[PDB]
Design a protein around this ligand. Structure first.
Ligand SMILES: *[C@@H]1O[C@H](CO)[C@@H](O)[C@H](O)[C@H]1NC(C)=O
Ligand SMILES: *[C@@H]1O[C@H](CO)[C@@H](O)[C@H](O)[C@H]1NC(C)=O
Ligand SMILES: *[C@@H]1O[C@H](CO)[C@@H](O)[C@H](O)[C@H]1NC(C)=O
Ligand SMILES: [Cl-]
Ligand code: NA
Ligand code: NA
Length: 151
């Protein structure tokens, strides 16, 4: 027994021993699935959670306008008034937000941007990033995927 609400993302939530459900449009974990917005928002097992899936090295050359195309599963369609998708990258301690597009439930793309980083001897920089929607609803990234900027 415990507060399902303490789980911050879907995968932790549905894997809880507390017996919890994830509300994908409200972005919260609950013991009572009736607190989700509607039935289709209720996630009960990990395979149904929104998540990025394993992919080969995401390689973006510095100083060139490029999109970043990410493979996923179960990405939610925003409800009325909810904001869409963004990529949030931490590059050497600074946060960059890039507009993104959900092409479908299995594909999200950070839209065209150029990227830079400091360091003449770093030929390939691993960058922490999140895909979010509605400002701060984070998509689970269980394989710990990184963006790799390269020189
Ligand atoms: C924790 O769960 C109890 C129900 O067992 C509830 O009364 C309380 O509001 C919950 N707290 C939070 C912060 O969700
Ligand atoms: C993205 O940027 C490249 C390079 O500037 C450009 O050639 C391409 O047309 C752009 N694509 C979109 C969809 O804006
Ligand atoms: C999802 O969108 C991408 C990009 O447009 C496309 O390549 C892919 O085939 C789509 N997948 C499905 C199942 O529609
Ligand atoms: Cl919901
Ligand atoms: Na969500
Ligand atoms: Na992942």
């Amino acid at each position: 027994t415990g507060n399902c609400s303490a789980h911050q993302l879907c995968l932790s939530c549905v894997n809880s021993a507390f017996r919890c459900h994830w509300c994908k449009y409200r972005n919260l974990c609950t013991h009572d699935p009736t607190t989700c917005s509607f039935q289709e928002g209720r996630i009960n097992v990990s395979e149904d959670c929104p998540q990025l899936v394993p992919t080969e090295e995401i390689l973006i050359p510095v100083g060139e306008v490029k999109p970043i195309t990410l493979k996923a599963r179960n990405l939610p369609q925003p409800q009325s008034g909810q904001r869409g998708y963004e990529c949030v990258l931490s590059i050497q301690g600074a946060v960059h937000r890039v507009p993104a597009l959900r092409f479908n439930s299995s594909s999200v793309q950070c839209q065209n941007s150029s990227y830079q980083y400091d360091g003449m001897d770093i030929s390939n920089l691993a960058v922490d990033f999140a895909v979010v929607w509605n400002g701060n609803f984070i998509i689970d990234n269980p394989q710990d995927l990184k963006v790799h900027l390269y020189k």
